[PDB]
Design an enzyme around this catalytic site. Structure first.
Site, PDB file in Angstrom:
ATOM      1  CB  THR B  68      46.627  31.161  50.161  1.00  0.00           C
ATOM      2  OG1 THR B  68      47.044  31.921  49.028  1.00  0.00           O
ATOM      3  CG2 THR B  68      45.554  30.178  49.788  1.00  0.00           C
ATOM      4  CG  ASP B 148      27.204  37.274  46.300  1.00  0.00           C
ATOM      5  OD1 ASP B 148      26.972  36.200  45.689  1.00  0.00           O
ATOM      6  OD2 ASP B 148      28.262  37.475  46.946  1.00  0.00           O
ATOM      7  NE  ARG B 210      41.963  37.726  39.979  1.00  0.00           N
ATOM      8  CZ  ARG B 210      43.242  37.415  39.812  1.00  0.00           C
ATOM      9  NH1 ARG B 210      44.188  38.037  40.532  1.00  0.00           N
ATOM     10  NH2 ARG B 210      43.568  36.471  38.927  1.00  0.00           N
ATOM     11  CG  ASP B 234      44.957  47.830  44.551  1.00  0.00           C
ATOM     12  OD1 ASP B 234      45.949  48.566  44.604  1.00  0.00           O
ATOM     13  OD2 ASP B 234      44.970  46.671  44.989  1.00  0.00           O
ATOM     14  CD  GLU B 239      47.037  43.876  38.294  1.00  0.00           C
ATOM     15  OE1 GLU B 239      47.750  43.024  38.844  1.00  0.00           O
ATOM     16  OE2 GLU B 239      46.125  44.448  38.905  1.00  0.00           O
ATOM     17  CG  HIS B 256      46.896  43.409  42.567  1.00  0.00           C
ATOM     18  ND1 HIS B 256      46.806  42.368  41.670  1.00  0.00           N
ATOM     19  CD2 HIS B 256      46.116  43.066  43.618  1.00  0.00           C
ATOM     20  CE1 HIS B 256      46.016  41.433  42.161  1.00  0.00           C
ATOM     21  NE2 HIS B 256      45.573  41.842  43.338  1.00  0.00           N
ATOM     22  N   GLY B 259      45.531  44.471  49.512  1.00  0.00           N
ATOM     23  CA  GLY B 259      45.592  43.452  50.564  1.00  0.00           C
ATOM     24  C   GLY B 259      46.860  43.425  51.421  1.00  0.00           C
ATOM     25  CE1 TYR B 260      50.469  41.703  48.393  1.00  0.00           C
ATOM     26  CE2 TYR B 260      52.028  43.356  47.596  1.00  0.00           C
ATOM     27  CZ  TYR B 260      51.446  42.094  47.497  1.00  0.00           C
ATOM     28  OH  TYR B 260      51.832  41.214  46.509  1.00  0.00           O
TER      29      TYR B 260
HETATM   30  N1  LIG Z   1      43.210  43.858  45.347  1.00  0.00           N
HETATM   31  C1  LIG Z   1      43.758  43.002  46.221  1.00  0.00           C
HETATM   32  O1  LIG Z   1      45.070  43.184  46.703  1.00  0.00           O
HETATM   33  C2  LIG Z   1      42.965  41.809  46.693  1.00  0.00           C
HETATM   34  C3  LIG Z   1      43.130  41.307  47.981  1.00  0.00           C
HETATM   35  C4  LIG Z   1      42.258  40.330  48.454  1.00  0.00           C
HETATM   36  C5  LIG Z   1      41.229  39.865  47.638  1.00  0.00           C
HETATM   37  N2  LIG Z   1      41.084  40.365  46.365  1.00  0.00           N
HETATM   38  C6  LIG Z   1      40.023  39.871  45.453  1.00  0.00           C
HETATM   39  O2  LIG Z   1      38.724  40.318  45.794  1.00  0.00           O
HETATM   40  C7  LIG Z   1      37.760  39.314  45.597  1.00  0.00           C
HETATM   41  C8  LIG Z   1      37.001  39.163  46.896  1.00  0.00           C
HETATM   42  O3  LIG Z   1      37.769  38.354  47.752  1.00  0.00           O
HETATM   43  P1  LIG Z   1      36.981  37.522  48.870  1.00  0.00           P
HETATM   44  O4  LIG Z   1      37.934  37.063  49.895  1.00  0.00           O
HETATM   45  O5  LIG Z   1      35.812  38.355  49.259  1.00  0.00           O
HETATM   46  O6  LIG Z   1      36.462  36.198  48.094  1.00  0.00           O
HETATM   47  P2  LIG Z   1      35.017  35.516  48.304  1.00  0.00           P
HETATM   48  O7  LIG Z   1      34.967  34.251  47.529  1.00  0.00           O
HETATM   49  O8  LIG Z   1      34.783  35.302  49.742  1.00  0.00           O
HETATM   50  O9  LIG Z   1      33.921  36.522  47.704  1.00  0.00           O
HETATM   51  C9  LIG Z   1      33.350  36.372  46.422  1.00  0.00           C
HETATM   52  C10 LIG Z   1      31.863  36.663  46.520  1.00  0.00           C
HETATM   53  O10 LIG Z   1      31.390  37.159  45.289  1.00  0.00           O
HETATM   54  C11 LIG Z   1      30.206  36.463  44.922  1.00  0.00           C
HETATM   55  N3  LIG Z   1      30.043  36.408  43.467  1.00  0.00           N
HETATM   56  C12 LIG Z   1      30.538  35.475  42.604  1.00  0.00           C
HETATM   57  N4  LIG Z   1      30.160  35.832  41.356  1.00  0.00           N
HETATM   58  C13 LIG Z   1      29.430  36.978  41.409  1.00  0.00           C
HETATM   59  C14 LIG Z   1      28.801  37.774  40.444  1.00  0.00           C
HETATM   60  N5  LIG Z   1      28.630  37.320  39.211  1.00  0.00           N
HETATM   61  N6  LIG Z   1      28.117  38.917  40.816  1.00  0.00           N
HETATM   62  C15 LIG Z   1      28.061  39.253  42.152  1.00  0.00           C
HETATM   63  N7  LIG Z   1      28.676  38.454  43.106  1.00  0.00           N
HETATM   64  C16 LIG Z   1      29.356  37.345  42.741  1.00  0.00           C
HETATM   65  C17 LIG Z   1      30.328  35.093  45.537  1.00  0.00           C
HETATM   66  O11 LIG Z   1      29.051  34.555  45.771  1.00  0.00           O
HETATM   67  C18 LIG Z   1      31.062  35.403  46.819  1.00  0.00           C
HETATM   68  O12 LIG Z   1      30.124  35.692  47.829  1.00  0.00           O
HETATM   69  C19 LIG Z   1      38.506  38.044  45.211  1.00  0.00           C
HETATM   70  O13 LIG Z   1      38.261  37.794  43.843  1.00  0.00           O
HETATM   71  C20 LIG Z   1      39.975  38.350  45.433  1.00  0.00           C
HETATM   72  O14 LIG Z   1      40.803  37.866  44.397  1.00  0.00           O
HETATM   73  C21 LIG Z   1      41.944  41.319  45.891  1.00  0.00           C
END
Ligand SMILES: NC(=O)c1ccc[n+]([C@@H]2O[C@H](COP(=O)([O-])OP(=O)(O)OC[C@H]3O[C@@H](n4cnc5c(N)ncnc54)[C@H](O)[C@@H]3O)[C@@H](O)[C@H]2O)c1
Ligand SMILES: NC(=O)c1ccc[n+]([C@@H]2O[C@H](COP(=O)([O-])OP(=O)(O)OC[C@H]3O[C@@H](n4cnc5c(N)ncnc54)[C@H](O)[C@@H]3O)[C@@H](O)[C@H]2O)c1
Lengths: 375, 378
Positions: B68, B148, B210, B234, B239, B256, B259-260
């Site tokens: 995960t 970031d 999200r 997406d 949702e 959504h 990631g799939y």
């Molecule tokens: N749509 C999908 O099917 C799908 C698939 C995978 C991941 N995601 C989502 O995408 C996001 C990214 O995933 P990830 O693996 O990169 O996680 P990650 O934790 O590695 O990346 C998050 C980054 O965002 C930064 N951040 C936190 N708050 C912030 C803000 N206020 N402004 C700017 N930057 C900020 C953090 O410092 C971190 O570097 C996750 O929230 C995850 O749920 C969605």
């Protein structure tokens, strides 16, 4: 004692090929060479008539086009002057344009193409090739071609009314005739369009006035469940823009434009001329063409609809020509500018497919891909 | 005296992979029978299992794995206190998301007739997904701005700009933050009414992180007002009950599924397998190609240099985001069909599953950098 052949300077492969038969001077589509030449190969730009030729020793005129509007075939033959066009040279292009449209609509709309009933109106160079390929996929196809029928050709030729009753895709590939028993001007008028089945797809990549564009627009605007693909428009270059917005695919009269297509223009006229002077010769089309961007690809497993769609669209995705036409359609000069600037397109045969599945290879070959089976 | 390994019975390739390291028993993730935890050496879970003192106390489990990307369901601090090994699968699905974003952008660049290298891409959130997007845009020489603050406040090195700066200089804005409801980093409605309105004419807005990171209501409001904006979504507020009129208005909307990929999904188990191998002194790396079925198109030749149209053709041979946008538009306002699309989601591969042989060396270098398995064959 050798033939002097004048060719149009922008005609691809013309110098390469015609020298197998004589001296080639390249004219822009100029008097002095005309009176001391034996053959003339032309494009659409050159009107060929008594005026231009009478008195010369020119003994043969080839035109590197399916079309012949710009030539008086009649006067030449009256005069003993050999003539040749390149009939069918762009036919495969149109068939793959049609297939590209259908496979996009099939995915976008969640239906199964092998389940459709397709009426082909006009079963000539384009329609007969389309028939061959739809059949290989096992799609039921209804044929309408009253001239061929009347002339005694073999085949199950139905009436247009019969196609309208039974088909859910209707594609036109007839010429433009304004009167007589085979009149095609407004062959698809309001009455016909209105009878089309719910969810039917209407395709016109032949001549614009074959479909009444205003009537089609009005039916679409009244909410008739109907999908439309147009490559040709009444009033070209000034198409009905409102109509373009309501159609699923509109493009600027480019369905016939492939590289292989331009090269077949030159190729057929070469072969006719080579036959004309007692020296019959054929030409590898693949010896002339530059390698395409994507030349070879492997396929694992059976061919199904999404797999076929990915293959055709790797070669040609009709949406790449639809999108730029929507961006500029009501701007004078622009429609013609998109034709002049048309980007390189290849045919399915330029793509070599290696299949581990025997059936996928057999099917791909019958669709016109260069497919093989790898045991 | 073999290790006993408990695996969530729905995690892909679990038995195939772990039965190399020990006895493996498949277990439901909610609830996990206690008799089982009491005799286990290691637990591999998915997000349905809350891992904390109540689950593991007094058990012999010395390692927890979660196939995960995220770690919300895990009390990591407690695991540290108790001396228990932990591993998630950070980034397991990041490439899926990045290739999805490229799929969307390549579709829009063709539709609208712009060049990518004339666009400025603001990435908000630069972690697993954000930084992979970066690498790839930069390899293409596309100008990117990074936002970031959690990385800037940590003192990470990089050209970290503020959000507002991205809004001034970028015409593509893409969000990859988690959802924080408050605190200094609140990302809830991070793109709100005021922010949307200031986006440059012809801007493209993408949200594949999200749902609630973008105020869906505000966004619909701007679109209806006729703001020249392009939108790729997406993820959605509320949702599966997404705002339907906002769907009809976006340029691409998918359910959504960013990631799939088969790869994304198998990488959860892989990274956890790897981390555990090392944990018990059997460091073992595992290549996805030998686990996943062979792809439909596994090899292709490319003659000459890469250009945008050529790249679009390659990315879309692999994954054309329009194939997910089309089914959603057909069923969006029918309650339950959104979840059904995710449930029955058909196979999608990553660019790395395409082996590309280029007669141009610079095309190869570039495609390699982009995540294709590209090689120069003179
Ligand atoms: N749509 C999908 O099917 C799908 C698939 C995978 C991941 N995601 C989502 O995408 C996001 C990214 O995933 P990830 O693996 O990169 O996680 P990650 O934790 O590695 O990346 C998050 C980054 O965002 C930064 N951040 C936190 N708050 C912030 C803000 N206020 N402004 C700017 N930057 C900020 C953090 O410092 C971190 O570097 C996750 O929230 C995850 O749920 C969605
Ligand atoms: N869109 C393009 O870029 C482009 C390219 C190639 C061809 N075309 C056009 O497409 C059409 C078909 O081309 P082709 O090469 O097959 O020409 P073709 O002469 O080989 O075939 C036309 C066929 O239509 C039949 N026909 C005539 N009247 C008919 C009628 N009233 N009802 C049904 N059928 C009738 C004829 O008998 C003939 O079999 C032509 O109009 C051609 O100019 C357009």
């Amino acid at each position: 004692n050798a033939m002097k052949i004048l060719v149009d300077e922008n005609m691809p492969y013309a110098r390469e090929l015609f020298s197998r038969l004589g001296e080639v001077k390249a004219v822009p589509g100029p008097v002095e060479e005309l009176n001391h030449a034996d053959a003339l190969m032309v494009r659409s730009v050159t009107k060929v008539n008594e005026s231009l030729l009478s008195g010369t020793p020119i003994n043969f005129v080839g035109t590197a086009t399916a079309g012949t509007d710009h030539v008086d075939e009649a006067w030449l033959k009256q005069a003993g002057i050999g003539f040749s066009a390149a009939p069918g040279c762009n036919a495969i292009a149109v068939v793959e344009y049609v297939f590209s449209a259908l496979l996009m609509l099939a995915e976008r709309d969640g239906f199964s193409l092998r389940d459709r009933t397709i009426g082909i109106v006009g079963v000539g160079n384009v329609g007969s090739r389309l028939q061959t390929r739809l059949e290989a996929l096992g799609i039921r196809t209804l044929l309408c071609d009253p001239p061929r029928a009347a002339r005694g050709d073999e085949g199950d030729f139905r009436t247009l009314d019969e196609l309208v009753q039974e088909a859910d895709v209707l594609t036109f590939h007839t010429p433009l005739y304004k009167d007589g028993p085979y009149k095609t001007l407004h062959l698809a008028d309001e009455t016909l369009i209105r009878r089309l089945k719910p969810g039917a797809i209407l395709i016109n990549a032949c001549r614009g006035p074959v479909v009444d564009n205003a009537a089609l627009l009005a039916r679409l605007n009244a909410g008739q469940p109907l999908s439309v693909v147009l490559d040709v428009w009444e009033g070209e270059p000034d198409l009905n823009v409102a109509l373009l917005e309501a159609v699923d695919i509109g493009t600027s009269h480019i369905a016939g434009y492939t590289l292989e297509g331009k090269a077949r223009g030159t190729t057929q006229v070469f072969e006719a001329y080579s036959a004309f002077i007692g020296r019959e010769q054929r030409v590898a089309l693949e010896t002339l063409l530059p390698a395409p961007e994507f030349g070879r690809i492997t396929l694992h497993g059976p061919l199904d609809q999404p797999t076929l769609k990915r293959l055709a669209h790797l070669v040609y995705d009709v949406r790449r020509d639809d999108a730029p036409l929507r961006k500029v359609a009501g701007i004078p000069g622009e429609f013609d500018k998109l034709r002049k600037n048309y980007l390189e397109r290849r045919e399915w045969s330029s793509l070599y497919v290696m299949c581990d599945d025997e059936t996928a290879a057999a099917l791909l070959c019958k669709l016109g891909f260069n497919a093989v089976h790898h045991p």
